[PDB]
Design an enzyme around this catalytic site. Structure first.
Site, PDB file in Angstrom:
ATOM      1  N   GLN A 266       0.826  -1.219   0.000  1.00  0.00           N
ATOM      2  CA  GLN A 266       0.000   0.000   0.000  1.00  0.00           C
ATOM      3  C   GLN A 266       0.856   1.263   0.000  1.00  0.00           C
ATOM      4  O   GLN A 266       0.657   2.173  -0.830  1.00  0.00           O
ATOM      5  CB  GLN A 266      -0.939   0.034   1.205  1.00  0.00           C
ATOM      6  CG  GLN A 266      -1.777   1.322   1.220  1.00  0.00           C
ATOM      7  CD  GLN A 266      -2.782   1.354   2.352  1.00  0.00           C
ATOM      8  OE1 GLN A 266      -3.688   0.554   2.375  1.00  0.00           O
ATOM      9  NE2 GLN A 266      -2.626   2.301   3.281  1.00  0.00           N
TER      10      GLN A 266
ATOM     11  N   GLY B  59       4.486  -3.065   6.807  1.00  0.00           N
ATOM     12  CA  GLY B  59       3.531  -4.013   6.273  1.00  0.00           C
ATOM     13  C   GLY B  59       4.205  -5.314   5.840  1.00  0.00           C
ATOM     14  O   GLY B  59       5.414  -5.396   5.677  1.00  0.00           O
TER      15      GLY B  59
ATOM     16  N   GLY C 224       5.176  -4.851   1.900  1.00  0.00           N
ATOM     17  CA  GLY C 224       6.269  -3.892   1.815  1.00  0.00           C
ATOM     18  C   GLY C 224       7.557  -4.440   2.405  1.00  0.00           C
ATOM     19  O   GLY C 224       8.646  -4.182   1.894  1.00  0.00           O
TER      20      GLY C 224
ATOM     21  N   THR D 290      -0.488   0.301  11.681  1.00  0.00           N
ATOM     22  CA  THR D 290      -1.593  -0.649  11.598  1.00  0.00           C
ATOM     23  C   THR D 290      -1.222  -2.043  12.143  1.00  0.00           C
ATOM     24  O   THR D 290      -2.021  -2.975  12.010  1.00  0.00           O
ATOM     25  CB  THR D 290      -2.102  -0.745  10.175  1.00  0.00           C
ATOM     26  OG1 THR D 290      -1.012  -0.838   9.252  1.00  0.00           O
ATOM     27  CG2 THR D 290      -2.934   0.553   9.790  1.00  0.00           C
TER      28      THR D 290
ATOM     29  N   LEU E  82      22.587   6.095 -11.587  1.00  0.00           N
ATOM     30  CA  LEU E  82      22.359   5.450 -10.300  1.00  0.00           C
ATOM     31  C   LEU E  82      23.669   5.094  -9.606  1.00  0.00           C
ATOM     32  O   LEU E  82      23.788   5.241  -8.389  1.00  0.00           O
ATOM     33  CB  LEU E  82      21.485   4.207 -10.494  1.00  0.00           C
ATOM     34  CG  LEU E  82      20.043   4.491 -10.918  1.00  0.00           C
ATOM     35  CD1 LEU E  82      19.284   3.187 -11.160  1.00  0.00           C
ATOM     36  CD2 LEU E  82      19.330   5.338  -9.864  1.00  0.00           C
TER      37      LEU E  82
ATOM     38  N   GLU F  32      26.221   6.695  -9.305  1.00  0.00           N
ATOM     39  CA  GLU F  32      26.835   7.834  -8.632  1.00  0.00           C
ATOM     40  C   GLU F  32      26.263   8.081  -7.247  1.00  0.00           C
ATOM     41  O   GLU F  32      26.921   8.743  -6.438  1.00  0.00           O
ATOM     42  CB  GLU F  32      26.670   9.081  -9.497  1.00  0.00           C
ATOM     43  CG  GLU F  32      27.924   9.930  -9.620  1.00  0.00           C
ATOM     44  CD  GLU F  32      27.663  11.236 -10.359  1.00  0.00           C
ATOM     45  OE1 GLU F  32      27.187  11.171 -11.515  1.00  0.00           O
ATOM     46  OE2 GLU F  32      27.911  12.321  -9.772  1.00  0.00           O
TER      47      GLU F  32
HETATM   48  C1  LIG Z   1      -6.954   7.609   9.907  1.00  0.00           C
HETATM   49  C2  LIG Z   1      -6.112   8.004  10.912  1.00  0.00           C
HETATM   50  N1  LIG Z   1      -6.105   7.461  12.274  1.00  0.00           N
HETATM   51  C3  LIG Z   1      -7.002   6.475  12.648  1.00  0.00           C
HETATM   52  O1  LIG Z   1      -7.737   5.989  11.887  1.00  0.00           O
HETATM   53  C4  LIG Z   1      -6.872   6.045  14.062  1.00  0.00           C
HETATM   54  C5  LIG Z   1      -8.144   6.465  14.835  1.00  0.00           C
HETATM   55  N2  LIG Z   1      -5.746   6.671  14.724  1.00  0.00           N
HETATM   56  O2  LIG Z   1      -5.842   8.027  15.082  1.00  0.00           O
HETATM   57  C6  LIG Z   1      -4.484   5.965  15.007  1.00  0.00           C
HETATM   58  O3  LIG Z   1      -3.609   6.506  15.588  1.00  0.00           O
HETATM   59  C7  LIG Z   1      -4.319   4.525  14.590  1.00  0.00           C
HETATM   60  C8  LIG Z   1      -2.982   3.925  14.854  1.00  0.00           C
HETATM   61  O4  LIG Z   1      -1.877   4.696  14.480  1.00  0.00           O
HETATM   62  C9  LIG Z   1      -2.799   3.756  16.376  1.00  0.00           C
HETATM   63  N3  LIG Z   1      -3.956   3.472  17.112  1.00  0.00           N
HETATM   64  O5  LIG Z   1      -1.733   3.850  16.966  1.00  0.00           O
HETATM   65  N4  LIG Z   1      -4.468   4.353  13.105  1.00  0.00           N
HETATM   66  C10 LIG Z   1      -5.081   3.135  12.567  1.00  0.00           C
HETATM   67  C11 LIG Z   1      -3.918   5.389  12.207  1.00  0.00           C
HETATM   68  O6  LIG Z   1      -3.407   6.345  12.634  1.00  0.00           O
HETATM   69  C12 LIG Z   1      -4.003   5.199  10.703  1.00  0.00           C
HETATM   70  C13 LIG Z   1      -2.899   4.234  10.341  1.00  0.00           C
HETATM   71  O7  LIG Z   1      -3.731   6.429  10.100  1.00  0.00           O
HETATM   72  C14 LIG Z   1      -4.353   6.682   8.869  1.00  0.00           C
HETATM   73  O8  LIG Z   1      -4.869   5.797   8.239  1.00  0.00           O
HETATM   74  C15 LIG Z   1      -4.240   8.103   8.362  1.00  0.00           C
HETATM   75  C16 LIG Z   1      -3.048   8.242   7.817  1.00  0.00           C
HETATM   76  C17 LIG Z   1      -2.741   9.778   8.011  1.00  0.00           C
HETATM   77  C18 LIG Z   1      -1.376  10.136   7.880  1.00  0.00           C
HETATM   78  C19 LIG Z   1      -3.201   9.989   9.515  1.00  0.00           C
HETATM   79  N5  LIG Z   1      -4.183   9.133   9.644  1.00  0.00           N
HETATM   80  C20 LIG Z   1      -5.028   9.067  10.807  1.00  0.00           C
HETATM   81  O9  LIG Z   1      -4.853   9.811  11.737  1.00  0.00           O
HETATM   82  N1  LIG Z   2       3.754   7.570   4.099  1.00  0.00           N
HETATM   83  C1  LIG Z   2       2.839   6.662   3.845  1.00  0.00           C
HETATM   84  N2  LIG Z   2       2.791   5.557   4.669  1.00  0.00           N
HETATM   85  C2  LIG Z   2       1.851   4.620   4.430  1.00  0.00           C
HETATM   86  C3  LIG Z   2       0.918   4.752   3.416  1.00  0.00           C
HETATM   87  N3  LIG Z   2       0.146   3.661   3.439  1.00  0.00           N
HETATM   88  C4  LIG Z   2       0.569   2.849   4.442  1.00  0.00           C
HETATM   89  N4  LIG Z   2       1.586   3.439   5.081  1.00  0.00           N
HETATM   90  C5  LIG Z   2       2.433   2.965   6.175  1.00  0.00           C
HETATM   91  O1  LIG Z   2       2.944   1.645   5.804  1.00  0.00           O
HETATM   92  C6  LIG Z   2       2.971   0.787   6.961  1.00  0.00           C
HETATM   93  C7  LIG Z   2       1.961  -0.345   6.832  1.00  0.00           C
HETATM   94  O2  LIG Z   2       2.298  -1.085   5.668  1.00  0.00           O
HETATM   95  P1  LIG Z   2       1.454  -1.128   4.303  1.00  0.00           P
HETATM   96  O3  LIG Z   2       2.228  -0.588   3.126  1.00  0.00           O
HETATM   97  O4  LIG Z   2       0.067  -0.485   4.413  1.00  0.00           O
HETATM   98  O5  LIG Z   2       1.287  -2.728   4.153  1.00  0.00           O
HETATM   99  P2  LIG Z   2       1.470  -3.598   2.821  1.00  0.00           P
HETATM  100  O6  LIG Z   2       2.805  -3.469   2.195  1.00  0.00           O
HETATM  101  O7  LIG Z   2       0.314  -3.388   1.954  1.00  0.00           O
HETATM  102  O8  LIG Z   2       1.509  -5.119   3.445  1.00  0.00           O
HETATM  103  P3  LIG Z   2       0.204  -6.045   3.986  1.00  0.00           P
HETATM  104  O9  LIG Z   2      -1.031  -5.214   3.913  1.00  0.00           O
HETATM  105  O10 LIG Z   2       0.563  -6.510   5.313  1.00  0.00           O
HETATM  106  O11 LIG Z   2       0.171  -7.114   2.884  1.00  0.00           O
HETATM  107  C8  LIG Z   2       2.694   1.713   8.140  1.00  0.00           C
HETATM  108  O12 LIG Z   2       3.917   2.240   8.595  1.00  0.00           O
HETATM  109  C9  LIG Z   2       1.771   2.785   7.568  1.00  0.00           C
HETATM  110  O13 LIG Z   2       1.817   3.972   8.235  1.00  0.00           O
HETATM  111  C10 LIG Z   2       0.961   5.896   2.572  1.00  0.00           C
HETATM  112  O14 LIG Z   2       0.179   6.067   1.652  1.00  0.00           O
HETATM  113  N5  LIG Z   2       1.924   6.828   2.823  1.00  0.00           N
HETATM  114 MG   LIG Z   3      -1.706  -4.020   2.185  1.00  0.00          MG
END
Ligand SMILES: C=C1NC(=O)[C@H](C)N(O)C(=O)[C@H]([C@@H](O)C(N)=O)N(C)C(=O)[C@H](C)OC(=O)[C@@H]2C[C@H](C)CN2C1=O
Ligand SMILES: Nc1nc2c(ncn2[C@@H]2O[C@H](COP(=O)(O)OP(=O)(O)OP(=O)(O)O)[C@@H](O)[C@H]2O)c(=O)[nH]1
Ligand SMILES: [Mg+2]
Ligand SMILES: Nc1nc2c(ncn2[C@@H]2O[C@H](COP(=O)(O)OP(=O)(O)O)[C@@H](O)[C@H]2O)c(=O)[nH]1
EC number: 3.6.5.-
Lengths: 155, 425, 428
Positions: free
Chosen positions: B10, B134, B137, B170, B243, B245
Site C-alpha cells: 500500500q 507491512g 512492503g 496498523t 544510479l 553515482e
Molecule cells: C486515519 C487516521 N487514524 C485512525 O484511523 C486512528 C483512529 N488513529 O488516530 C491511530 O492513531 C491509529 C494507529 O496509528 C494507532 N492506534 O496507533 N491508526 C489506525 C492510524 O493512525 C491510521 C494508520 O492512520 C491513517 O490511516 C491516516 C493516515 C494519516 C497520515 C493519519 N491518519 C489518521 O490519523
Molecule cells: N507515508 C505513507 N505511509 C503509508 C501509506 N500507506 C501505508 N503506510 C504505512 O505503511 C505501513 C503499513 O504497511 P502497508 O504498506 O500499508 O502494508 P502492505 O505493504 O500493503 O503489506 P500487507 O497489507 O501486510 O500485505 C505503516 O507504517 C503505515 O503507516 C501511505 O500512503 N503513505
Molecule cells: Mg496491504
C-alpha cells in the site's frame, strides 16, 4: 441382593420400586462401592419423595461416602432446595466437612445456589469454615466476584 | 539510460501515485500519456503514437489499492500489465510476504519487469518504494530484491522506504517486519532513503498548518523529496548523473547505505505571498533537525558525505558562500577520511501540484547526508524488537508462514553489527 | 474477503439471528434481501458477509445448525428469518439434552457431515475466503459439543483459514443445569487448540450488567442478547466497512494474539443501554467507559491483570484529535496495566457510521490476562461437580471416558497458569 436394586431405584427415581424393595427387607442403608447410600443418590438426582420415604424408614441422614460426602453436601451441590430443607428438618449436619474440606455452604456458594445458601445460613452454616486451601464461602464469593452471593453471606 | 520504478504494497503504491503525478507535471505529460511539446526518457517510454508511459510497476498482494489506480485519474497512464495484484495480503506478516503468499506471484512480477527491461537500451537499475511495517512492503520487497540481484547482477537498486511510527501504524509487529526486511535487503540494496512517518507527519502539521494530515498530504511531500533526488536522472544532470553515482557520492561502505534526507522550504499554500527565502536561509534550514525525513540528531553524529541538490533560482556563488558559513559551525563534524559538500543545481523551480499543500517557491534544496546519527533510528527499532522477541511475542505467526525461528536472531545480530558499523566510523 | 458464518444450537442461533438483524439494518439490507440504504459505505464491503444472488438480492453467508428442530422454526419466524438460504438450515430431530457428549460424539456426529457439505458449497463459491465465524454457547450440548466438533472438522479441511468464535460462557445466574461447567470445560479445551480468535461472551457479565447497571429486575434472554448483538456489531465493524486497521480476520489476529493459545478476548462497549432506552456521550466518556470493568462482556476486572493487546473502535462523527488524545491518556495514566514488553500494543479505528439508535459508540477488544478469572470460575464449578462424579454417567454412557474430563480440566488450568505467567513477566 436387594441393596443394589434399591440403590438403582433411588438413583433412577422409581418411587414404586423403592417401596416394593423396602417392603421386602431391602437395606435402606445399603452402600455402593464408593460408600453412597440410597439417600445419597436420591438427594443427588432430585427425587424428593424417595428422600422423604427413606428418612421415614431408618436412613442415616448424615451417612458419608468414602470421600466424606453427606446427602446434604450433594443436595447443596446439585441445587435441590426442597431436599435441602427436608434433610435439615431430619437432622442433617449443616457443617459436615468432606475430604476436600468443603461444607454444604461451600458447594452451594460455588454453584451459585443462592436460595440454598440463605437456607444453610439460617440453619447455622459456619461462615468461618475453611476448605483445604483456606477459603471460606465468603472468600469464594469475593475471589469470583459474585456480588449477589457476597451480599447474602454478609447479612 | 533507463530506470525502472517498482512500487510494493500500500505505502509503495500510494507514494508511487504521488511521485508519478508529480513527474508527469514536471515533464508536461498529461494523465493519458500525451505531451503537448529527451531527458525524461529515462523514466518514460514512448509508444509510436506520442504516448509516454512510465517505466513503472505496481505490485500488491491484495487488489484494493491498485484497483484505485486502475480506475482513477491515471487509469490510462501506466502499462495495465504492470499493475499486478494478488487476492490475499500478507497480514502484516513479513513471512507471508516473503515465503508463502509472495511466492505465488513473484514469477509473474519478474516476468513483467523483464518486459520493461527488454524495452531498455541501457538499463541502469531499479527504484523500489515500500513500507517497512507491512507484510508486503517488508517481505515481498525482500524477496523481489533477492531475485533482482540474481537476475540483474550488475544493475543498481535504490530504495525509498517508510520507517514506522506508532502514532500512524496498523500493526504491533511493525518493528519485527522492519528488522527482517532490513536484514535480508542490506546485501541487495545500494542506497536506501528512509522516511519516518512521524517526522513527515509533524512537518505537515507544523509547516503546512494541517491539523490532521492525510496519507495524501504525507505522500505529496515525500514526492517532492523523491523528485529532488531523481531530478538529476530525469534532466541534464551534472551531479548524480546515473544510479551508480549515488553510491559513489553518498555511500562510502556498502552496508552503511542509509542517507538522511532534509528538505527546505516547506511553506503552506495559504501563504502565497510569503517572503522568498534566500539560498543561505534554505541551506541553513537543511541543518535544523525539524526539517529531516528521519528523527535523529546529526549533531550527535559525524558526516561521511553530504550532497546538496538545489532547484530553482540559485546562483552558484551564493551556494558556495552559504556553504562557507555553515562549514565554520562546530556542530557539523565530518569524519577525517572524507573530503566536503557536493552540489547540484537544477535551474527550474519546484513544480506545484494542483491540489497540493505547498506554496510555489523560487528556490528549494534537498540535502542528502550520510550521518552516523541515523543509527539512533535503528536503535529505536532494535529496542522494540528486543522487548517483544525476548518473550517470543507473535513469533508463532512467522514460524507458521514458512520462516524458521532462527531468522529472527540472525536478523537482530545483523542489526547489532550495523549499529557497530556506525559506532566505529 | 468472504466470511462464512455458522450458528449452532439454541443460543448460537438466537444470537446469530440477532447479529444478522443488526448488521442488515446497518448495511441497508431489508428482510427480503433488497438494499434500501442511504450510503455507498454500506455496500463497499457487503460481500464480506453477504452473497449477491439474482436481481440485486443479498443473502447472508450463514449456515444454521441444530439437533433440535424447534430453533429453526423460531429463527424463520423472526424478522429476517426468510432471508437465509433454506438449504443452509441443517437440523436434526433428536436434540442433545444439554449433553456435550451427545453433541460431539452421538447425534451431532451423525449430522456433522451434512453440515460440512453445506460449508463446502458456501466456501467453493467464495472469491477469496477469509475464514469462519461460529456463534454458540459452551454450556449446552449442540453448540458446545457439536460446535466444537464442527470446528475441528473445518480446521482439518481449511487449515489455512481463520477460525473465529463468539462463545457464550455459562453462569449459574442464567442456568438450565449444573452440568454446564462440564460442557464448557470440555469445549474450552477444544477452543484452545482449534480456534484463532474467541470472543468470550459471559452470561455472568451480561446478567450483572442488566440487573445492576440497567436496573432490570428479571433479565430475559432478549435483554442479554441486546448486549450481545451490540458487541457483535461493534467488534465486526472493522471487517464490514472500509478502513486501515484490523480490516480482516487475520490482521486482527496478528495484532491481538501474541501467543497461539491466548486468543480469548474480553469485549466491552459504551454506552450500555436497555432495549427501548434513549445525550450522546463525549469521546472522554466513551473512552473511560469502554475500559471500565462494568462495561466488559466477560466477568473479569481488567485492573486485576495486564493488557497484552487492545483494539478499540469508535463509531460516529467525532474529533479524531480527541480520539487519539483520549486513547493516549488512558495508556499513559495506566501504563502499568499494559505489558511493557509489547510496545504500542493498543490500536484504534474510527468508523463514521454509528450503530442504530446512537450518534456515538465505542467498542473495546482486550486480550487481558484478567480473563483467567473467567476460566478459574468455570474450573472451580467443574471441579466441585467432578470431585463428586455427579452426572458423569450421562457422558460415559455416550462413550466418553473420565480421562477426557481430566485432560480438559488440566488443559484449562494450564491456560490459567499461562495467563498468570505473562501477567507476572517483566521487561528486565
Ligand atoms: C486515519 C487516521 N487514524 C485512525 O484511523 C486512528 C483512529 N488513529 O488516530 C491511530 O492513531 C491509529 C494507529 O496509528 C494507532 N492506534 O496507533 N491508526 C489506525 C492510524 O493512525 C491510521 C494508520 O492512520 C491513517 O490511516 C491516516 C493516515 C494519516 C497520515 C493519519 N491518519 C489518521 O490519523
Ligand atoms: N507515508 C505513507 N505511509 C503509508 C501509506 N500507506 C501505508 N503506510 C504505512 O505503511 C505501513 C503499513 O504497511 P502497508 O504498506 O500499508 O502494508 P502492505 O505493504 O500493503 O503489506 P500487507 O497489507 O501486510 O500485505 C505503516 O507504517 C503505515 O503507516 C501511505 O500512503 N503513505
Ligand atoms: Mg496491504
Ligand atoms: N445469552 C444467551 N444465552 C443463552 C441463550 N440461549 C441459551 N443460552 C445459554 O446457553 C446455555 C445452554 O445452551 P443452549 O444453546 O440452550 O444448548 P444447545 O441448544 O444444546 O446448544 C446456557 O448457558 C444458557 O444460559 C440466548 O439466547 N442468549
Amino acid at each position: 441382593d436387594l441393596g443394589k436394586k434399591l440403590l438403582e431405584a433411588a438413583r433412577a427415581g422409581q418411587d414404586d420400586e423403592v417401596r416394593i424393595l423396602m417392603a421386602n427387607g431391602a437395606d435402606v442403608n445399603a452402600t455402593d462401592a464408593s460408600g453412597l447410600t440410597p439417600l445419597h443418590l436420591a438427594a443427588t438426582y432430585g427425587h424428593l419423595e424417595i428422600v422423604e420415604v427413606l428418612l421415614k424408614h431408618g436412613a442415616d441422614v448424615n451417612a458419608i461416602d468414602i470421600m466424606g460426602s453427606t446427602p446434604l453436601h450433594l443436595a447443596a451441590l446439585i441445587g435441590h432446595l426442597e431436599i435441602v430443607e427436608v434433610l435439615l428438618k431430619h437432622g442433617a449436619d449443616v457443617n459436615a466437612v468432606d475430604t476436600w474440606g468443603d461444607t454444604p455452604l461451600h458447594l452451594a456458594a460455588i454453584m451459585g445456589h443462592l436460595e440454598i445458601v440463605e437456607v444453610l445460613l439460617k440453619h447455622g452454616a459456619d461462615v468461618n469454615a475453611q476448605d483445604k486451601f483456606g477459603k471460606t464461602a465468603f472468600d469464594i464469593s469475593i475471589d469470583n466476584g459474585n456480588e449477589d452471593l457476597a451480599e447474602i453471606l454478609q447479612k | 539510460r533507463e530506470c525502472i520504478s517498482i512500487h510494493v504494497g500500500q505505502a509503495g503504491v500510494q507514494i508511487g501515485n504521488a511521485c508519478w503525478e508529480l513527474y508527469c507535471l514536471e515533464h508536461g505529460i498529461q494523465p493519458d500519456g500525451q505531451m503537448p511539446s529527451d531527458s525524461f526518457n529515462t523514466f518514460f517510454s514512448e509508444t509510436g503514437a506520442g504516448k509516454h508511459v512510465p517505466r513503472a510497476v505496481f505490485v500488491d498482494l491484495e487488489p484494493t489499492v491498485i484497483d484505485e489506480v486502475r480506475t482513477g485519474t491515471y487509469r490510462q497512464l501506466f502499462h495495465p500489465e504492470q499493475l499486478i495484484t494478488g487476492k490475499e495480503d500478507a497480514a502484516n506478516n513479513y513471512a507471508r510476504g516473503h515465503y508463502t503468499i509472495g511466492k505465488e506471484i513473484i514469477d509473474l512480477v519478474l516476468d513483467r519487469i523483464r518486459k520493461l527491461a527488454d524495452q531498455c537500451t541501457g538499463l541502469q537499475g531499479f527504484l523500489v518504494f515500500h513500507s517497512f511495517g507491512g507484510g508486503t512492503g517488508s517481505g515481498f520487497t525482500s524477496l523481489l530484491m533477492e531475485r533482482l540481484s540474481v537476475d540483474y547482477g550488475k544493475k543498481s537498486k535504490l530504495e525509498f522506504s517508510i520507517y514506522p511510527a506508532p502514532q500512524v501504524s496498523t500493526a504491533v509487529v511493525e518493528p519485527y517486519n522492519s528488522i527482517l526486511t532490513t536484514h535480508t535487503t542490506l546485501e541487495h540494496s545500494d542506497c536506501a532513503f528512509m522516511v519516518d512517518n512521524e517526522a513527515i507527519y509533524d512537518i505537515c502539521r507544523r509547516n503546512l498548518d494541517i491539523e490532521r494530515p492525510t496519507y495524501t498530504n504525507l505522500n505529496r511531500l515525500i514526492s517532492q523529496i523523491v523528485s529532488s533526488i531523481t531530478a538529476s536522472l530525469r534532466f541534464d544532470g551534472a551531479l548524480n548523473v546515473d544510479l551508480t553515482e549515488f553510491q559513489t557520492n553518498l555511500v562510502p561502505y556498502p552496508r552503511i547505505h542509509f542517507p538522511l534526507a532534509t528538505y527546505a522550504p516547506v511553506i503552506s499554500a495559504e501563504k502565497a505571498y510569503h517572503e522568498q527565502l534566500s539560498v543561505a536561509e534554505i541551506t541553513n534550514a537543511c541543518f535544523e533537525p525539524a526539517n529531516q525525513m528521519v528523527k535523529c540528531d546529526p549533531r550527535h553524529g559525524k558526516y561521511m558525505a553530504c550532497c546538496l541538490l538545489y532547484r530553482g533560482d540559485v546562483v552558484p556563488k551564493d551556494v558556495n558562500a552559504a556553504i562557507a558559513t555553515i562549514k565554520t559551525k562546530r556542530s557539523i563534524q565530518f569524519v577525517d577520511w572524507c573530503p566536503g559538500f557536493k552540489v547540484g543545481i537544477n535551474y527550474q523551480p519546484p513544480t506545484v501540484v494542483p491540489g497540493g499543500d505547498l506554496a510555489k517557491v523560487q528556490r528549494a534544496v534537498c540535502m542528502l547526508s550520510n550521518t552516523t546519527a541515523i543509527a539512533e533510528a535503528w536503535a529505536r527499532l532494535d529496542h522494540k524488537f528486543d522487548l517483544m522477541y525476548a518473550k517470543r511475542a507473535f513469533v508463532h505467526w512467522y514460524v507458521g508462514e514458512g520462516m524458521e525461528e532462527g531468522e529472527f536472531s540472525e536478523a537482530r545480530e545483523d542489526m547489532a553489527a550495523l549499529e557497530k558499523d556506525y559506532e566505529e566510523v | 474477503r468472504e466470511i462464512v458464518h455458522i450458528q449452532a444450537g439454541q443460543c448460537g442461533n438466537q444470537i446469530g439471528a440477532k447479529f444478522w438483524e443488526v448488521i442488515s439494518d446497518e448495511h441497508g439490507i431489508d428482510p427480503s434481501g433488497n438494499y434500501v440504504g442511504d450510503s455507498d459505505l454500506q455496500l463497499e464491503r457487503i460481500s464480506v458477509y453477504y452473497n449477491e444472488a439474482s436481481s440485486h438480492k443479498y443473502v447472508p453467508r450463514a449456515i444454521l445448525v441444530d439437533l433440535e428442530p424447534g430453533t429453526m422454526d423460531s429463527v424463520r419466524s423472526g424478522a429476517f428469518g426468510h432471508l437465509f438460504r433454506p438449504d443452509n438450515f441443517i437440523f436434526g430431530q433428536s436434540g442433545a439434552g444439554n449433553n456435550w457428549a451427545k453433541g460431539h460424539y452421538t447425534e451431532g456426529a451423525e449430522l456433522v457431515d451434512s453440515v460440512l457439505d453445506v460449508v463446502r458449497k458456501e466456501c467453493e463459491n467464495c472469491d477469496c475466503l477469509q475464514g469462519f465465524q461460529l456463534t454458540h454457547s459452551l454450556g449446552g450440548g449442540t453448540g458446545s459439543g457439536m460446535g466444537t466438533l464442527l470446528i475441528s472438522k473445518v480446521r482439518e479441511e481449511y487449515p489455512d483459514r481463520i477460525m473465529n468464535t463468539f462463545s457464550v460462557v455459562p453462569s449459574p445466574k442464567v442456568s438450565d443445569t449444573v452440568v454446564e461447567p462440564y460442557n464448557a470445560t470440555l469445549s474450552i479445551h477444544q477452543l484452545v487448540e482449534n480456534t484463532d480468535e474467541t470472543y468470550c461472551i459471559d452470561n455472568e457479565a451480561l446478567y450483572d450488567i442488566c440487573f445492576r447497571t440497567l436496573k432490570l429486575a428479571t433479565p430475559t434472554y432478549g435483554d442479554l442478547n441486546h448486549l450481545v448483538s451490540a458487541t457483535m456489531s461493534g467488534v465486526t465493524t472493522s471487517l464490514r466497512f472500509p478502513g486501515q486497521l484490523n480490516a480482516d480476520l487475520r490482521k486482527l489476529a496478528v495484532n491481538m494474539v501474541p501467543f497461539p493459545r491466548l486468543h480469548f478476548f474480553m469485549p466491552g462497549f459504551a454506552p450500555l443501554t436497555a432495549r427501548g432506552s434513549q445525550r450522546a456521550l463525549t469521546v472522554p466518556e466513551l473512552t473511560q467507559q469502554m475500559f471500565d470493568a462494568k462495561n466488559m462482556m466477560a466477568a473479569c476486572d481488567p485492573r486485576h491483570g495486564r493488557y497484552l493487546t487492545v483494539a478499540t473502535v469508535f463509531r460516529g462523527r467525532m474529533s479524531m484529535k480527541e480520539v487519539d488524545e483520549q486513547m493516549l491518556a488512558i495508556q499513559s495514566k495506566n501504563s502499568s496495566y499494559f505489558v511493557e514488553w509489547i510496545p504500542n500494543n493498543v490500536k484504534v479505528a474510527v468508523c463514521d457510521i454509528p450503530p442504530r439508535g446512537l450518534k456515538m459508540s465505542s467498542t473495546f477488544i482486550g486480550n487481558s490476562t484478567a480473563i483467567q478469572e473467567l476460566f478459574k470460575r468455570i474450573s472451580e464449578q467443574f471441579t466441585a461437580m467432578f470431585r463428586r462424579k455427579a452426572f458423569l454417567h450421562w457422558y460415559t454412557g455416550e462413550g466418553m471416558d473420565e480421562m477426557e474430563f481430566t485432560e480438559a480440566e488440566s488443559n484449562m488450568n494450564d491456560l490459567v497458569s499461562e495467563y498468570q505467567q505473562y501477567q507476572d513477566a517483566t521487561a528486565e
